Design an enzyme around this catalytic site. Sequence first.
Site, PDB file in Angstrom:
ATOM      1  N   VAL A 107      48.061  31.974 101.581  1.00  0.00           N
ATOM      2  CA  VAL A 107      47.693  30.605 101.209  1.00  0.00           C
ATOM      3  C   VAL A 107      47.430  29.738 102.435  1.00  0.00           C
ATOM      4  CG1 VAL A 107      48.422  28.585  99.868  1.00  0.00           C
ATOM      5  CG2 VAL A 107      49.022  30.881  99.105  1.00  0.00           C
TER       6      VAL A 107
ATOM      7  N   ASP B 160      58.451  32.706  86.664  1.00  0.00           N
ATOM      8  CA  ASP B 160      58.775  32.888  88.090  1.00  0.00           C
ATOM      9  C   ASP B 160      59.282  31.584  88.700  1.00  0.00           C
ATOM     10  OD1 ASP B 160      59.112  34.407  90.451  1.00  0.00           O
ATOM     11  OD2 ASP B 160      57.028  34.234  91.057  1.00  0.00           O
TER      12      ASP B 160
ATOM     13  N   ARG C  34      52.714  32.401 102.080  1.00  0.00           N
ATOM     14  CA  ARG C  34      52.293  33.700 101.575  1.00  0.00           C
ATOM     15  C   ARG C  34      53.218  34.151 100.471  1.00  0.00           C
ATOM     16  NH1 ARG C  34      52.577  37.635 106.700  1.00  0.00           N
ATOM     17  NH2 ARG C  34      51.675  38.953 105.051  1.00  0.00           N
TER      18      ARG C  34
ATOM     19  N   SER D 268      49.252  36.856  97.396  1.00  0.00           N
ATOM     20  CA  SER D 268      48.287  36.003  98.072  1.00  0.00           C
ATOM     21  C   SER D 268      48.661  35.684  99.516  1.00  0.00           C
ATOM     22  CB  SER D 268      48.164  34.672  97.332  1.00  0.00           C
ATOM     23  OG  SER D 268      49.353  33.929  97.506  1.00  0.00           O
TER      24      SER D 268
ATOM     25  N   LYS E  95      44.286  29.664  97.738  1.00  0.00           N
ATOM     26  CA  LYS E  95      45.152  30.801  97.490  1.00  0.00           C
ATOM     27  C   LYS E  95      44.255  32.020  97.469  1.00  0.00           C
ATOM     28  CE  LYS E  95      48.549  32.690  94.198  1.00  0.00           C
ATOM     29  NZ  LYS E  95      49.451  32.365  93.052  1.00  0.00           N
TER      30      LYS E  95
HETATM   31  N1  GNP Z   1      52.658  23.264 101.996  1.00  0.00           N
HETATM   32  C1  GNP Z   1      52.186  23.873 100.890  1.00  0.00           C
HETATM   33  N2  GNP Z   1      52.434  25.191 100.720  1.00  0.00           N
HETATM   34  C2  GNP Z   1      51.966  25.826  99.617  1.00  0.00           C
HETATM   35  C3  GNP Z   1      51.240  25.098  98.585  1.00  0.00           C
HETATM   36  N3  GNP Z   1      50.908  25.975  97.611  1.00  0.00           N
HETATM   37  C4  GNP Z   1      51.415  27.174  97.986  1.00  0.00           C
HETATM   38  N4  GNP Z   1      52.050  27.063  99.187  1.00  0.00           N
HETATM   39  C5  GNP Z   1      52.774  28.104  99.935  1.00  0.00           C
HETATM   40  O1  GNP Z   1      52.244  29.374  99.598  1.00  0.00           O
HETATM   41  C6  GNP Z   1      53.277  30.165  98.996  1.00  0.00           C
HETATM   42  C7  GNP Z   1      52.627  31.170  98.062  1.00  0.00           C
HETATM   43  O2  GNP Z   1      51.934  30.521  97.018  1.00  0.00           O
HETATM   44  P1  GNP Z   1      52.084  31.156  95.544  1.00  0.00           P
HETATM   45  O3  GNP Z   1      51.009  30.553  94.718  1.00  0.00           O
HETATM   46  O4  GNP Z   1      53.553  31.112  95.178  1.00  0.00           O
HETATM   47  O5  GNP Z   1      51.578  32.664  95.870  1.00  0.00           O
HETATM   48  P2  GNP Z   1      52.141  34.057  95.245  1.00  0.00           P
HETATM   49  O6  GNP Z   1      51.461  35.109  96.052  1.00  0.00           O
HETATM   50  O7  GNP Z   1      51.728  34.134  93.714  1.00  0.00           O
HETATM   51  N5  GNP Z   1      53.835  34.061  95.508  1.00  0.00           N
HETATM   52  P3  GNP Z   1      55.005  35.044  94.656  1.00  0.00           P
HETATM   53  O8  GNP Z   1      55.385  36.143  95.576  1.00  0.00           O
HETATM   54  O9  GNP Z   1      56.236  34.072  94.406  1.00  0.00           O
HETATM   55  O10 GNP Z   1      54.324  35.592  93.335  1.00  0.00           O
HETATM   56  C8  GNP Z   1      54.231  29.160  98.344  1.00  0.00           C
HETATM   57  O11 GNP Z   1      55.536  29.686  98.055  1.00  0.00           O
HETATM   58  C9  GNP Z   1      54.224  28.110  99.453  1.00  0.00           C
HETATM   59  O12 GNP Z   1      55.133  28.496 100.497  1.00  0.00           O
HETATM   60  C10 GNP Z   1      51.035  23.666  98.844  1.00  0.00           C
HETATM   61  O13 GNP Z   1      50.397  22.956  98.029  1.00  0.00           O
HETATM   62  N6  GNP Z   1      51.516  23.153  99.983  1.00  0.00           N
HETATM   63 MN    MN Z   2      55.128  32.145  94.570  1.00  0.00          MN
HETATM   64 MN    MN Z   3      53.151  34.466  92.120  1.00  0.00          MN
END
Ligand code: GNP
Ligand code: MN
Ligand code: MN
Lengths: 371, 370
Positions: free
Chosen positions: A54, A195, A48, A52, A69
């Site tokens: 995820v 980021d 998360r 998002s 996502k």
């Molecule tokens: N195991 C796994 N985890 C994933 C993958 N993609 C995303 N995640 C998990 O989901 C999290 C959130 O995804 P992200 O796209 O960074 O979402 P965000 O809401 O934009 N995060 P931020 O707060 O950094 O802006 C990641 O940090 C990771 O822990 C993946 O391909 N595999």
């Molecule tokens: Mn992220």
């Molecule tokens: Mn992000």
Amino acid sequence: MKCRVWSEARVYTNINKQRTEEYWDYENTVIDWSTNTKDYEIENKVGRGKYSEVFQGVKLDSKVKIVIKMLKPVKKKKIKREIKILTDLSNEKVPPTTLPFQKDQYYTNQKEDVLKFIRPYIFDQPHNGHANIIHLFDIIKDPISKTPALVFEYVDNVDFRILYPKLTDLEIRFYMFELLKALDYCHSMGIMHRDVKPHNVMIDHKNKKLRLIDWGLAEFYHVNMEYNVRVASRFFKGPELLVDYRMYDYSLDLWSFGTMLASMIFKREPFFHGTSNTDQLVKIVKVLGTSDFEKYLLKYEITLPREFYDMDQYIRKPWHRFINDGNKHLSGNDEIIDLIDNLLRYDHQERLTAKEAMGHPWFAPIREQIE
Amino acid sequence: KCRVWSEARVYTNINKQRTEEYWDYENTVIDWSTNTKDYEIENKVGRGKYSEVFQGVKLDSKVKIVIKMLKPVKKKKIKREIKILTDLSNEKVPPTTLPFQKDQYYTNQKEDVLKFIRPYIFDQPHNGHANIIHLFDIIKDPISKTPALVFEYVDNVDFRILYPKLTDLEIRFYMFELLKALDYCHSMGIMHRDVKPHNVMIDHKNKKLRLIDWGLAEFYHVNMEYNVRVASRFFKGPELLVDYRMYDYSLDLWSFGTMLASMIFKREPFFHGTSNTDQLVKIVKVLGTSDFEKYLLKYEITLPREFYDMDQYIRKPWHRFINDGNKHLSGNDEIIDLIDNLLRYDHQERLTAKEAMGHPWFAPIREQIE
Ligand SMILES: Nc1nc2c(ncn2[C@@H]2O[C@H](COP(=O)(O)OP(=O)(O)NP(=O)(O)O)[C@@H](O)[C@H]2O)c(=O)[nH]1
Ligand SMILES: [Mn+2]
Ligand SMILES: [Mn+2]
Ligand SMILES: Nc1nc2c(ncn2[C@@H]2O[C@H](COP(=O)(O)OP(=O)(O)NP(=O)(O)O)[C@@H](O)[C@H]2O)c(=O)[nH]1
Ligand SMILES: [Mn+2]
Ligand SMILES: [Mn+2]
């Protein structure tokens, strides 16, 4: 126009003059959402963030594992931006970073004072950094729930706080090289990630696979554009963001990279551990020192934000001060110290570019294994 | 094996007071439930050297449980884990809930061991028994014959994620809770022998701590020589590494102390051996060769062969580990003194759990009890 002295990227300056509206104008895209959610079976939650939740899933067609996502509510243009950036990066037929190197198309900021920052080393070969960008497979929106979602390739990731302490010196070199390739590619495409941090870097260690994910704060680089400084995540924010110097560029990502690296090498996590936005700058200046901080403010004629006037005077902490028996296996050589020193500079122009960093002596054992 | 003999400073004679039905685990008959239908296994929650662990639900009550599926081991090892767990949970009046009796506590009456009595001690009843994980059932699928232990469920987060979030006061709180658990099990004549973060479940939202993983625990018997291949490398006390087999509950306080040093100084693990041999090296590189040699002499220990490539090391003062990243946890004299009095070569010198609980560092926690 906030900024007093203006700044331009040292490299890849004019990508979005070369490319046109169809490439960078994300606001004026129309998102063709897939209505058919029945193509994907959502299974367990994998992570998360601020934007998002995820989940891992399966594409029923092919049985390929995917991640979904599920986007929290934000302005529609922010969703268009993430998608446009992802598709720009994945759909480029001939990634610029796979072509022969052209120094004179690379170092495009021809200010005499900026050219003194060209390093005597540089990685001057084609590379596959485009393959380290996460691939977007689909864009779906439930017709009932109306929740927008991005469907990506799946990476088998372990939390950095579990993985990173296990990594050998050579493995850190390997993965950080892979990350630099990704950044060189996105920068070559006129895109700032904005980021860079461990939770945005997926690593499947058994497959020696690294992917730079989370393009939701990424932006297109336009010469003399003033960007929002409320981007990146606290511990990884460059001094430009904290002092509200808005005319920043790709070099922001190299500060973030450097902070990741310093944490890994010195085993202090996070390396710059601000307890607030204000204190983040304090933590940085406590290391790099007030003297060079002042010179930087003067160079750009920065009006320091009000909140930073309770800062005390700090003498620079030499990097060797962070070496101890717990981390000397990673920190105990001149190369890594020089690399970190050349990434973590107040002045964004002074910082190594991704290609320069890739050419640094510290990556020699990695480059030696390429051919 | 041992040349100079040693006895526990405290709780020395628990298993002379208690009889075979309490401590003789080899001669227990385990009544395995054979149904399995009572429990619905859901996702995996963890693993270890001896098991794979799943969360699940007790169908009748809808209560969340965990199911520890035991890897093959000698049957007496399974009997031991079960016997210890049932001994700990089934005690009607836990000894640590009764009024403190100094005379029944400090039971090793050698003049040289009595000088280790601290001028402070936690002398109140406490609920340490409630921090031991509760075993609910023992089941064995008649098909696979896989033995399994069913426990209460704790909503835990990996220590490498959680511990860095904890405030000074929160570390004080949880480590006090852990000391209560150890005081109780020691009062019951049981050594845990594998104290480490992965064996301490913390539901931070409910301020709840449970000491789990009793599969290497043993009953303490006076002058018994135990296997030293217990605990886990980073947490092994010097007694285990030098093959001093006549150890006692104080082993757990070393392990506790190493956990504490890692949390306070933000060096994880604190003693980071790359091997069994190197584990001792990492310890002596901090505490120093001089006190190490005095310890060997005290017990007339024949140092194992593998340690003769060790160099000479001068003691590292604790304040050397303080830095700006950890000073919010490490920057007071109390925590330094506590750590210093836990991490001693000589097991007899170490604080007991009750003494540790009485230490100035826990004052803010004790102040909030009544
Ligand atoms: N195991 C796994 N985890 C994933 C993958 N993609 C995303 N995640 C998990 O989901 C999290 C959130 O995804 P992200 O796209 O960074 O979402 P965000 O809401 O934009 N995060 P931020 O707060 O950094 O802006 C990641 O940090 C990771 O822990 C993946 O391909 N595999
Ligand atoms: Mn992220
Ligand atoms: Mn992000
Ligand atoms: N979330 C959660 N996880 C648990 C619980 N009980 C055990 N686990 C997970 O399962 C792991 C293994 O349990 P444990 O009983 O220590 O098994 P073991 O095989 O004896 N491990 P060791 O190798 O230390 O001897 C724990 O370290 C933990 O990660 C629980 O109640 N909740
Ligand atoms: Mn365990
Ligand atoms: Mn165990």
